[PDB]
Amino acid sequence: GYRKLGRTSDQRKAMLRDLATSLIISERIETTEARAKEVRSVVEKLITLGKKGDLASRRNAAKTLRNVEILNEDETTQTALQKLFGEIAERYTERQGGYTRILKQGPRRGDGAESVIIELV
Amino acid sequence: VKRTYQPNKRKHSKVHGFRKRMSTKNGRKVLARRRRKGRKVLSA
Amino acid sequence: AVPKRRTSKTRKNKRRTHFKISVPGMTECPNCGEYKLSHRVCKNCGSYNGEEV
Amino acid sequence: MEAKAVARTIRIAPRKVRLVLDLIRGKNAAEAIAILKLTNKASSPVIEKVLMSALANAEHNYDMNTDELVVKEAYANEGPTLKRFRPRAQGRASAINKRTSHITIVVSDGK
RNA sequence: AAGAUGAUGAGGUUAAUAGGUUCGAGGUGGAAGCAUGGUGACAUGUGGAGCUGACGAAUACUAAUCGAUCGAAGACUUAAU
RNA sequence: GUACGCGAGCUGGGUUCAGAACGUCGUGAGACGUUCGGUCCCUAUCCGUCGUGGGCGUAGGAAAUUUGAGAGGAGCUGUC
RNA sequence: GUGAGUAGCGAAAGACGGGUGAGAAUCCCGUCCACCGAUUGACUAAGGUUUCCAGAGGAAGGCUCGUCCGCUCUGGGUUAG
RNA sequence: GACCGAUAGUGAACCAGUACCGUGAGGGAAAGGUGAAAAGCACCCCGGAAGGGGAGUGAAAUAGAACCUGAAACCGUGUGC
RNA sequence: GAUUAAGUUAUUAAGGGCGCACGGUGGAUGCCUUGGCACUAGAAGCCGAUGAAGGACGUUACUAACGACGAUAUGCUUUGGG
């Protein structure tokens, strides 16, 4: 219980795992305000497992990320666990906290939702 | 619930059709009032 | 439960004194030179100017 | 000397329009374009597209400058409805009145 | 620390109000990997270990940017000075 | 006492609906003491009440601290 | 017209990247995720009578939106000793 | 014709016993008017388009196919007390 | 215009009320007739096995509906008016 979202305590656990593993890939996503005042509390507890680089932590981070596959390493595969411990966990090895930021776009049309852009700093 | 119109092509013609009007005599008085009033469709 | 009377045109217009919308709270985006809603980014060319976004 | 541009029978309601037309009345025309582009309601781009016709029929064909213009009056009258029904429970049916509206913006230049 | 919304209250770079972070207190009760014992189930040791949402501290790394709107000039008459 | 207070707050056991049976009365259809079963509807406009905010007034405009006109609350008692 | 901008919006898991467009939480393509699986799957009777399909449409219908469509305009579609 | 003049006179002045309701016999409404003549708005401009504003035809478009005159209810914007 | 007290009467308008002006929706009234109703005078009062009354399907250069027409089909022949 950090903050509920209208999801039924079972969907909210598997919704943040759909925003985290699509933020280490695209490096920025466009979403609503309250879906991105909580995913800054997940992906900053997950680059911390990137700065360790253990065997326990390569397993203990895999239970909050999906298994997707990335193609353009000039035609070389890169699983989203391997994009961390890698080009993500080496960009921030001397910044102690504060990996994300939230940029408010505007209210979206026809729903009135305060859209924001989260992006890795 | 099961409603009161279960449609059928055969019972609709074997009962209300043209040749069941002209069968009896009082069918020819029904057909004498629907081409008198000026209906388009005489027999269903 | 139903109304007992027809509510008049004096009592109707009084009840929507407080039924309105408020002004947006705009600013002047100082690089492009437009209006934008404050603490938000510009929809045109425009920086955030504490962040240059 | 003053212009106008009347849009009529727009699909939106007549009471939800005149909350937005209440907001810009008697204001400078340079601001009022950019107030309707920050409010998040449903009749803001509709009113905006007819305010930018009283600001192009005041520069063309009257030849007055669009730096001094002021909204003198802006009022929403009522157009004809479209009575459609809604099948409601126990064999009843209620009438739903989709209303339409007339929008008129009149700009001025203080003369 | 307040709350249906508005209100009240703690803050806005002269900054510790939230998030992260490094330290704890509380909670669970011995993580994985390897090393040893055994035919295997499992057991011991490295180690009061590891993981830890709301409570206590610490440090500006991230977001509280740039700005806007409202708001005084102090009436008269009569006894005191 | 307050519609033997209170069913647009709840109950429906009861009393008083259609079914059925006994005792009894009726030549008859049926009837007056018991018996088993038996749909309880509504989105609060105005006064009333409980909360909580805007406007203007208190002869200049503001930040705090307070006198209490009046009105509420409390009021029971055992044993050794 | 008042009731009132009130009661509703007809069981139910969505998230994002890309295009498209005057306009996108809703349309199309991609990956991940969830739900039925003696059925929410696959063929034929009854009944309906062009709905099926490709190219263009956005006034009405769709309980919102719409570039979309079982809705509108054009042109096609059903083969037996 | 000391009969009616679009809620009248036929149910029907509009392509009426027709949309539509019913298994069936059977029930059954709604609709009229540009101008003397279509001379029915060439061309520019805001718009994705609708819808506008000028210029033009006309005796008049403040008669533009929501098309003669245009009452009240009801919704608006302005101002003296 | 206060230096102190004492006593008075104002201005405000988030919005509402009355009057006037100007707009929209709405289709009453006025003025018209293609259609009716009520009745006089002359006709007239039957068609059908040589296939009737009523109909479905068809017919134009392009035909959705009514009109008139039937594979000789949006008409053909002939005698008269024009």
* C-beta pairs of A82-89 under 8 Å, 24+ apart in sequence: A83/A24, A83/A25, A84/A24, A84/A46, A84/A47, A84/A49, A84/A50, A85/A50, A85/A53, A85/A58, A88/A24, A88/A47, A88/A50, A88/A120, A89/A47, A89/A50, A89/A51, A89/A53
Helix (H) or strand (E) holding D81: strand D70-87
Contact yes or no for A85/A47 (Cβ under 8 A) = no
The helix/strand/coil state of A114 is strand
Whether the CB of C37 is below 8 Å from some CB of chain D: the reply is: yes
Q: Which two tokens stand for residue A68?
A: 């997707």
In angstroms, rounded to a whole number, what is the distance separating the alpha carbons of residues D64 and D104?
20
Q: Which two tokens stand for residue D98?
A: 């989709």
Who contacts D14 (Cβ-Cβ below 8 Å, separation ≥6)? D76, D77, D78, D79, D99, D100, D101
Using a 7 Å CB cutoff, list residues 1-53 of C near strand F: 1-5, 7, 11, 18
Q: Which two tokens stand for residue C8?
A: 């008049």
In angstroms, rounded to a whole number, what is the distance separating the alpha carbons of residues A94 and A102?
21
| Beta carbons of A103 and C53 less than 8 Å apart | yes
Resolution in A: 3.6
- The method of structure determination was cryo-EM
Contact yes or no for A115/A100 (Cβ under 8 A) = no
Give the distance, in angstroms, between the CA of residue C21 and the centroid of all CA atoms in the same chain: 6
| Distance between the alpha carbon (CA) of D91 and the C1' atom of G6, Å | 24
Whether the CB of C40 is below 8 Å from some CB of chain A: the reply is: yes
In angstroms, rounded to a whole number, what is the distance separating the alpha carbons of residues D45 and D97?
23
| Beta carbons of D23 and C23 less than 8 Å apart | yes
Rg (CA), chain D: 17
Helix (H) or strand (E) holding D44: helix D44-54
Nucleotides of G under 7 A from a protein CB: 1-3, 5, 10, 13-18, 23-26, 31-34, 46-48, 59-65
> CA D52, D57, D62 angle in degrees (round to 5)?
145
Provide φ and ψ at D24, rounded to 5°.
-115, 5
The helix/strand/coil state of D30 is helix
Strand partners, C37: C26
In angstroms, rounded to a whole number, what is the distance separating the alpha carbons of residues A29 and C48?
18
C13 C-beta less than 7 Å away from strand I: yes
CA distances to C17, C21, C46 from C14, in Å: 5, 16, 44
